[PDB]
Design an enzyme around this catalytic site. Structure first.
Site, PDB file in Angstrom:
ATOM      1  N   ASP A   1       0.837  -1.192   0.000  1.00 19.54           N
ATOM      2  CA  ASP A   1       0.000   0.000   0.000  1.00 19.54           C
ATOM      3  C   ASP A   1       0.875   1.247   0.000  1.00 19.54           C
ATOM      4  O   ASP A   1       1.817   1.355   0.792  1.00 19.54           O
ATOM      5  CB  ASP A   1      -0.935   0.001   1.210  1.00 19.54           C
ATOM      6  CG  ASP A   1      -0.188   0.023   2.532  1.00 19.54           C
ATOM      7  OD1 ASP A   1       0.091   1.130   3.040  1.00 19.54           O
ATOM      8  OD2 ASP A   1       0.126  -1.065   3.060  1.00 19.54           O
TER       9      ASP A   1
ATOM     10  N   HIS B   1       4.749   4.172  -3.443  1.00 18.55           N
ATOM     11  CA  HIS B   1       5.496   5.363  -3.832  1.00 18.55           C
ATOM     12  C   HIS B   1       6.065   6.117  -2.637  1.00 18.55           C
ATOM     13  O   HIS B   1       7.043   6.856  -2.798  1.00 18.55           O
ATOM     14  CB  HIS B   1       4.602   6.292  -4.655  1.00 18.55           C
ATOM     15  CG  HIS B   1       3.201   6.392  -4.140  1.00 18.55           C
ATOM     16  ND1 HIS B   1       2.172   5.615  -4.627  1.00 18.55           N
ATOM     17  CD2 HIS B   1       2.658   7.167  -3.171  1.00 18.55           C
ATOM     18  CE1 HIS B   1       1.056   5.913  -3.988  1.00 18.55           C
ATOM     19  NE2 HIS B   1       1.323   6.851  -3.097  1.00 18.55           N
TER      20      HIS B   1
ATOM     21  N   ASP C   1     -10.709   0.622  -0.582  1.00 13.46           N
ATOM     22  CA  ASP C   1     -10.596   2.004  -0.139  1.00 13.46           C
ATOM     23  C   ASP C   1     -11.517   2.972  -0.866  1.00 13.46           C
ATOM     24  O   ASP C   1     -11.750   4.070  -0.350  1.00 13.46           O
ATOM     25  CB  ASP C   1      -9.151   2.508  -0.289  1.00 13.46           C
ATOM     26  CG  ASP C   1      -8.259   2.079   0.860  1.00 13.46           C
ATOM     27  OD1 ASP C   1      -7.522   1.084   0.702  1.00 13.46           O
ATOM     28  OD2 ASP C   1      -8.300   2.734   1.923  1.00 13.46           O
TER      29      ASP C   1
END
Ligand SMILES: OC[C@H]1O[C@H](O[C@H]2[C@H](O)[C@@H](O)[C@@H](O[C@H]3[C@H](O)[C@@H](O)[C@@H](O[C@H]4[C@H](O)[C@@H](O)[C@@H](O[C@H]5[C@H](O)[C@@H](O)[C@@H](O)O[C@@H]5CO)O[C@@H]4CO)O[C@@H]3CO)O[C@@H]2CO)[C@H](O)[C@@H](O)[C@@H]1O
Ligand SMILES: OC[C@H]1O[C@H](O[C@H]2[C@H](O)[C@@H](O)[C@@H](O)O[C@@H]2CO)[C@H](O)[C@@H](O)[C@@H]1O
Lengths: 1526, 67
Positions: A533, A536, A668
């Site tokens: 999750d 980045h 999400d």
């Protein structure tokens, strides 16, 4: 079997893209291991690295790579292994990288710089995907169906979880994604992990307890498993956070956040005593909003000391000035700015007299001034006594120093409270989030930016918690010192979690790295992969290390990541280095119907009818290559990567976009019920499932849950209600993808078309191998937007079949239970009424939708393109080698090349080149004309190109390729090549129109490569084993050597005749030129190996001897104009080259020709009994040339007059030649004649140049005299071996001179006559008149010329003498003379014909100018500036030879102690050929131009491909080969 | 630089190849046939421990003339 991929590298060591697929990653295709083979039995893949020959990287080059050498060796990121690059100027080197285990591998190259230093290239990565199997059935990566389930909503028992497993198994998902099954933190959020190394005590109690459950999912339901792995944070109540608090950023590890700490605990302390004074403790008014802002402005901001974190303490520095005033008190340099420029003086102290960390944040008084240097400046600037206005001056400076810090403070504070009343507003005053609860201890007004606790060690620490900045580069650590987000309150925090401070490595946080390592490899033993999750936000080096630790435990680790970095380039770099196998894409992000169609278009595949890659004219074709003679050495059980055709050039490794895992809904994003409607659940999942990639869904999407499940609070359990909502359809969609997964392989094998009309979205999935396809019509329900009717769907050359159709309807609202998450009751009604009309004539299918097709419905059609079966690819990729079996180097010319003028010759002017509408005609009529255009088309998949449009508009170009060969059918092997083209083009015409362009380019490309390979096999080893550049130069031999109908080299027959150039020197009398043929004979015929063809040309031209000369224009055997003094000596030089190279070449000397002219220079007509007459031997012909020149030639051109030359004057026809017997030089010519290679006769009536030669080279020419010396040396050693009989030569009066004496005469007088000494003091010994001189250190271009200044003109003709007669030159004189030519006369591709510093210099040639300029008009500039390419060949051949004798840096020790050229010389040679390699690469004609304007400017009048332009470059490669490569 | 046979003339700088048969047990014997008196030399090239090429000195031996 064959699992090898070809990774070609550039000259700088970078990988070469074979196709333009976009920003991507060198990913190797996921394929199962061979039948019954495990990891380690054999390499999974072998990457063949191809390094260009002579490239700058090859100089002491080494290939570094972290690929383990064998399966026994473990993988290390930073342990690279050496690989030696085999340097060669001819042959490329191939280095194999055997890979035994999937993972991340990189390679870089080290080499010797041009500065003799060491240089290194970038690291270039490539990913080997994991192999995913369940029991023993292989799961293709693009057939993954992932069901994400949250642990805390599946029940309290392992068997209650296995109830959920059976439900998702019925929907036919093959993979389950788990939210982390670890012990959860305080808030019980699945991502706030209490202990990483302990599973949930409620459900599991051992590692084997979860390992058995996952293995149960594998054997029972055929489902693989993977979990989330959390690197960025941990729960705020971990007992190891107390034991080891340094694992996060605290006031010790990250001191810059101390300012943010004292502000966070200033708001938790404020919100707890807020109600005491709280004017608006919890209200929703405009006046309420400002009153808390005033409370923030006055209760915390005013009580935080004006923030000395930025500002230097003003009065506490003056206090620390008087205290020790009298220590270090002196300065020096006058760089101290005046007090008038206060800004410069203020910052001067900032750069000189400051303590470490000035400007940066840290402790309360972090920014400080170095007093000992500041007072030393104050004494130097003002006074040594303190009371002399220092208190005023020192304070004035410090206030000016704090001016930027104060404005840095006002910009910070404004962002602190603007972020507060804009966040408190949305949180409290409900705009879209209803949560205006009274301030409690659980929910104050201030979100805990820092988690406060008391540890062991004694100290009370204060770690923070991560989150996400709204806008900003995710690669910037908001907790690091580079960001000010925790201070300016620009962080949306997660109180459940807490920082995880990784450093540059394990050295900055030892226990954190050791714990996360054991946490990673624990899940790696159990599960098949990971999910990351916010990947980045995880640092690269952190993610690299732990993902490599996991792959050492589970070599087939499947990595998924939600990756949204700054751009696609950063996304690919993360996939490259981390080894990510799939990227998460979300379908719910599409706000409208058009955005969904664009998202689906991105991950659907390639356009329908996409071009297929083929090796063309940019590949090496080694004559010694393995071949699938009928494309049959493949077994399906081997699972080998296939070559493109019968030639075994392995599959190219090119960057492809990283694989995608398309999620119709994650855990999400909001439910379709929230963002759109519930009915959209059906069409949205259908569009996603049709994409050619991995798909997935969250649990509840199929079960139409009402709203997004709160991962933090909710405790209800998933419903056991079976077969609700889309569960029936997902079983169909996943089962259909299982049928497709069996055969669909690479990116070129699955094509797609997507259409969007209003609320409808059309998806057409097509397999490019067999033609099977699916058609999806999905009416989306983003909103209830009225009835919309879709037009008639039309499919060309296709039959459709109804598969299934459904509609999703809502039956009220969802139940409201406190124990079980239940979905909305929905009806799944099957639909009918779809009319599939098929026109039995046009073969067109029409599809009409029924009016009962409400929004939220789909309909799937099975479709099949007509004319395509499974056996189509094999029929096209086979038989082409057998069809070219009987081809010869002559017959290939008619299959590949033939200019339009050459084709008009065979077709009497009826055929020609196929004209492409809105484009033009290909350069050649053969396959090369198509390949030169198709290579850029195939690379960019330009289906909108005029050629692509014409190919699908009809079969004209298809039949044109086959019908051409009727003109040359009777030639060797052409009939069988035509039959292969006929049978394959016939099979192609039965395909749909839109598929013809891709298949037309595939058939042409295959036959082209087979013809090009056949050429390399028929040629010699030096050519058939070299780089693309050398082979491309050798293919020019086939372009020029052809049989014709209007001309030949023999007057009685029509045989192969080397043309001067295409297309303007190919037909009638314009084709054969004796001067040009024998300059190119060594390169195009001897270097290539066409020994028999070189003999035929020498014999044919020997028949047409007259005046002891070879004719410039050879009309086979009729009227061969003898206007050449140059040709005969290039001809006698080609005879020496023939005897020197051809084994047993001395047999040419005794070959009897039928000399078609009497010995006495007379005139016999074509039809004359005295034509055949007598026979002549080459021994006799050579002697006739030598003795006739010595004995004095005397002739006027026969048939002189307007019939011969329409411009040449009468005195020009009488040109003569004689040998000055004191020098040995051969003089000759007039100022009205043009008997040299610079043959330009003026023809401008407005500039008055008619008959005036532009470059009359009368007298001793360096080319003629150099070839004379070489011819004498040749026949001298020929008689010494007993191969030449004649040894006397008679002079015009009657005396005799031995041939040796003539050779000695030139040896003793050549350099004396031509060399211009560089020093004026030596001009007395070299026959030089210093008044007419240009440069010194130059070998003259002419001797005793009519125009005395043309004698001393710097021209590239002397290099011909340096090549053929190097004995005439002292080394130091020749080396310096040819170095001048390199700096002055050397252009990029062509050689400047005249010194640019000369007054006659006009480098622009435009034949057709009608001006009054004596040069530019009618193209008299021909040889007075323009850059010719063949002179470059003779130049670099002598540039290499004399730099090898002179410069000591150009020599290196060799094997057998033979002096070999250094890499320093090879580097200089290779650089001077880059422009030629670029030229032949990016030219429609596959050769080198004849002429070039100034500094590389393209000349339109120049012939685009010339015989002796490429032949002279082949001379250089043969020189380096025959002398050093033994 | 020993000529391979009597027909080949002697050249100071033209050296001829001879392959050393590597073995961990058996020594290798290589014959140098000399047909004419004169000056002859020999040196050895081998693969260095740096995987590079290395060369030894030139070692000469004289065959006296026949008077
Ligand atoms: O069949 C009988 C034959 O008789 C006549 O032939 C003669 C020509 O009349 C005469 O002018 C001459 O032709 C020579 C020319 O004098 C000589 O200078 C040289 O010419 C150059 C051009 O100046 C140059 O521009 C270039 O020509 C190219 C051109 O650049 C290119 O863009 C394209 O247009 O093709 C042109 C060639 O076709 O290069 C040439 C060649 O270096 O060489 C010429 C050929 O020797 O001598 C001829 C002797 O027969 C009639 O004129 C002719 O029609 C009759 O067929
Ligand atoms: O001298 C005439 C001759 O050479 C010219 O080149 C040089 C010359 O050699 C120098 O002495 C000085 O005059 O500069 C000249 C160049 O500007 C011309 O270039 C040449 O055409 C001419 O025939």
């Amino acid at each position: 079997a064959h699992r090898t991929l070809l990774l070609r590298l550039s000259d700088s060591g970078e990988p070469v893209t074979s196709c333009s697929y976009g920003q991507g990653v060198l990913t190797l295709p996921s394929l199962p291991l061979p039948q019954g083979k495990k990891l380690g039995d054999m390499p999974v893949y072998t990457v063949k690295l191809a390094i260009p020959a002579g490239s700058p990287v090859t100089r002491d080059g080494l290939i570094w790579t972290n690929c383990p050498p064998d399966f026994s060796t473990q993988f290390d990121r930073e342990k690279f292994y050496k690989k030696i690059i085999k340097t060669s100027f001819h042959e490329d080197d191939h280095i194999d990288l055997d890979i035994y285990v999937p993972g991340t591998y990189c390679f870089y190259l080290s080499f010797k710089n041009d500065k003799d230093e060491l240089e290194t290239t970038r690291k270039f990565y490539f990913v080997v995907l994991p192999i995913l199997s369940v029991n023993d059935k292989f799961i293709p990566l693009n057939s993954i169906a992932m069901q994400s389930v949250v642990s805390k909503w599946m029940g309290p028992t392992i068997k209650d979880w296995e109830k959920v497993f059976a439900r998702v198994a019925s929907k036919k998902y093959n993979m389950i994604h788990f939210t982390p099954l670890q012990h959860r933190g305080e808030s019980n959020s699945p991502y706030s992990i209490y202990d990483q190394l302990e599973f949930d005590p409620t459900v599991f109690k051992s590692e084997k307890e979860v390992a058995d459950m996952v293995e149960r999912l594998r054997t029972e339901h055929n489902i693989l498993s993977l979990t989330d792995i959390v690197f960025n944070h941990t729960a705020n109540n971990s007992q190891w956070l107390l034991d080891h608090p340094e694992a996060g950023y605290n006031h010790k590890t990250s001191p810059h956040l101390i300012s943010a700490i004292e502000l966070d605990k200033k708001l938790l302390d404020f919100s707890e005593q807020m109600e005491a004074l709280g004017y608006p403790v919890d209200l929703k008014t405009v006046d309420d909003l400002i009153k808390v802002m005033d409370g923030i402005k006055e209760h915390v901001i005013g009580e935080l000391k004006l923030w000395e974190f930025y500002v230097v303490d003003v009065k506490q520095t003056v206090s620390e000035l008087r205290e020790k005033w009298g220590n270090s008190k002196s300065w020096s340099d006058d760089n101290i700015p005046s007090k008038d420029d206060s800004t410069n003086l203020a910052q001067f102290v900032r750069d000189n007299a400051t303590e470490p960390g000035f400007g940066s944040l840290g402790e309360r008084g972090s920014n400080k001034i170095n007093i000992d240097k500041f007072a030393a400046i104050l004494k130097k600037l003002h006074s040594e006594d303190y009371n002399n206005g220092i208190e005023e001056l020192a304070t004035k400076i410090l206030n000016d120093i704090n001016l930027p810090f104060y404005k840095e403070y006002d910009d910070d504070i404004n962002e602190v409270l603007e972020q507060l009343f804009n966040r408190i507003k949305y949180l409290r005053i409900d705009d879209h989030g209803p949560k205006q609860g009274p301030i409690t201890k659980k929910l104050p007004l201030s979100e805990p930016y820092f988690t406060r606790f008391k540890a062991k060690d004694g100290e009370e620490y204060a770690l923070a918690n991560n989150g996400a900045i709204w806008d900003g580069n995710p690669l910037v650590d908001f907790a690091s010192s580079q960001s000010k987000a925790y201070l300016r309150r620009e962080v949306i925090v997660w109180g459940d979690c807490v920082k995880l401070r990784y450093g540059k490595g394990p050295s900055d946080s030892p226990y954190l790295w050791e714990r996360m390592s054991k946490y990673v490899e624990m899940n790696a033993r159990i599960f098949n992969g990971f999910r990351i999750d916010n990947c980045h936000s995880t640092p690269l080096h952190v993610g690299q290390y732990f993902l490599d630790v996991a792959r050492r435990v589970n070599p087939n680790l499947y990595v998924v990541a939600e990756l949204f970095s700054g751009s696609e380039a950063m996304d690919c770099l993360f996939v490259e280095r981390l080894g990510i196998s799939s990227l998460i894409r979300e379908a719910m992000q599409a706000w409208s119907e058009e955005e969904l169609s664009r998202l689906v278009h991105r991950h659907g595949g390639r356009p329908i009818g996409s071009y297929k890659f083929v090796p063309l004219d940019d590949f090496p074709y080694p004559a010694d290559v393995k071949i699938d003679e009928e494309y049959c050495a493949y077994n399906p059980d081997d699972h080998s990567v296939k070559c493109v055709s019968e030639i075994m050039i392995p599959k190219t490794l090119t960057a492809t976009p990283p694989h995608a895992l398309f999620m119709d809904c994650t855990h999400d994003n909001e439910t379709p019920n929230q963002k759109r409607t519930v009915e959209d659940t059906l069409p949205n999942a259908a569009l996603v499932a049709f994409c050619s990639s991995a798909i997935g869904s969250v649990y509840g999407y199929d079960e139409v849950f009402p709203q997004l499940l709160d991962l933090v609070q909710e405790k209800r359990t998933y419903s056991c209600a079976e077969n609700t909502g889309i569960s029936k359809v997902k079983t169909l969609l996943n089962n259909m993808r299982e049928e497709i997964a069996s055969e669909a392989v690479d990116i070129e094998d699955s094509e797609m078309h997507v259409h969007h009309d209003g609320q409808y979205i059309t998806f057409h999935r097509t397999n490019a191998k067999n033609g099977k396809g699916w058609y999806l019509v999905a009416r989306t329900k983003f909103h209830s937007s009225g009835d919309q009717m879709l037009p008639r769907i039309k499919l060309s050359q296709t039959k459709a079949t109804f598969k299934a159709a459904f509609s999703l309807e809502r039956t009220g609202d969802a139940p409201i239970s406190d124990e079980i998450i239940e979905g909305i009751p929905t009806k799944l009604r099957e639909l009918t009424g779809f009319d599939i009309g098929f026109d039995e004539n046009t073969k067109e299918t029409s599809i009409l939708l029924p009016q009962d097709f409400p929004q939220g419905s789909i309909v799937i059609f099975e479709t099949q393109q007509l004319g395509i079966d499974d056996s189509l690819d094999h029929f096209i990729r086979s038989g082409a080698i057998k069809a070219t079996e009987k081809l010869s180097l002559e017959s290939i010319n008619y299959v590949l090349y033939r200019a339009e003028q050459e084709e008009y010759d065979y077709s009497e002017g009826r055929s020609g080149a196929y004209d492409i509408p809105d484009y033009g005609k290909p350069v050649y009529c053969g396959l090369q004309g198509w390949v030169s255009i198709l290579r850029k088309i195939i690379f960019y998949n330009d289906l909108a190109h005029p050629l692509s449009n014409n190919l699908r508009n009809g079969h004209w170009a298809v039949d044109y390729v086959v019908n051409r060969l009727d003109l040359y059918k009777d030639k060797e092997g052409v009939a069988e090549v035509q039959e292969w083209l006929r049978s394959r083009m016939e099979r192609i015409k039965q395909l749909p129109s839109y598929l013809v362009p891709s298949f037309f380019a595939l058939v042409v490309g295959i036959m082209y490569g087979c013809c090009r390979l056949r050429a390399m096999q028929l040629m010699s080893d030096n050519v058939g084993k070299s780089t693309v550049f050398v082979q491309s130069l050798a293919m020019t031999s086939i372009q020029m050597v052809s049989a014709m109908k209007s001309t030949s080299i023999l007057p009685d027959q029509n045989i192969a005749a080397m043309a001067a150039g295409l297309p303007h020197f190919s037909t009638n009398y314009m084709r054969c030129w004796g001067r040009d043929v024998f300059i190119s004979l060594r390169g195009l015929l001897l270097t290539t190996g066409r020994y028999e063809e070189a003999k035929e040309h020498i014999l044919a031209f020997a028949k047409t001897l007259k005046h002891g000369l070879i004719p410039n224009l050879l009309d086979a055997g009729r009227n061969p104009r003898y206007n050449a003094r140059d040709a005969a000596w290039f001809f006698v030089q080609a005879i020496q080259d023939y005897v020197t190279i051809v084994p047993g070449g001395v047999s040419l000397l005794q070959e009897k020709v039928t000399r078609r002219f009497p010995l006495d220079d007379e005139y016999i007509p074509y039809d004359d009994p005295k034509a055949f007459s007598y026979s002549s031997t080459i021994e006799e012909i050579i002697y006739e040339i030598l003795n006739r020149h010595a004995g004095g030639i005397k002739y006027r051109e026969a048939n002189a007059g307007p019939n011969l030359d329409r411009v040449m004057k009468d005195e020009g026809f009488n040109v003569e030649v004689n040998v000055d017997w004191e020098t040995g030089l051969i003089h000759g010519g007039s100022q009205f004649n043009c008997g040299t290679w610079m043959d330009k006769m003026g023809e401008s009536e407005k500039a008055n140049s008619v008959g005036v030669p532009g470059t009359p080279r009368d007298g001793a020419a360096v080319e003629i005299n150099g070839l004379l010396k070489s011819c004498l040396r040749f026949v001298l050693q020929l008689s010494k071996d007993g191969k030449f009989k004649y040894t006397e030569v008679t002079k015009p009066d009657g005396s005799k001179i031995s041939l040796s004496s003539w050779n000695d005469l030139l040896q003793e007088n050549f350099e004396r006559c031509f060399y211009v000494p560089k020093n004026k003091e030596d001009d007395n010994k070299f026959e030089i008149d210093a008044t007419i001189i240009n440069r010194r250190g130059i070998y003259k271009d002419l001797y005793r010329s009519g125009k005395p200044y043309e004698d001393y003109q710097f021209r590239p003709n002397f290099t011909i003498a340096m090549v053929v007669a190097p004995e005439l030159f002292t080394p130091d004189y020749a080396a310096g003379a040819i170095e001048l030519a390199d700096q002055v006369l050397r252009g990029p591709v062509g050689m400047r014909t005249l010194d640019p510093s000369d007054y006659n210099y006009r480098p622009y040639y435009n034949n057709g100018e009608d001006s009054d300029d004596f040069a530019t008009s009618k193209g008299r500039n021909y040889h007075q500036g323009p850059e010719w390419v063949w002179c470059y060949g003779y130049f670099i051949r002598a540039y290499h030879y004399f730099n090898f004798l002179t410069n000591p840096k150009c020599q290196v020790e060799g094997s057998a102690k033979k002096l070999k050229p250094s890499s320093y010389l090879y580097r200089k040679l290779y650089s001077r050929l880059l422009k030629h390699r670029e030229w032949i690469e990016n030219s429609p004609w596959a050769g080198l131009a004849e002429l070039t304007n100034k500094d590389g400017e393209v000349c339109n009048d120049s012939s685009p491909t010339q015989a002796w332009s490429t032949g002279c470059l082949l001379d250089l490669f043969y020189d380096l080969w025959i002398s050093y490569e033994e």
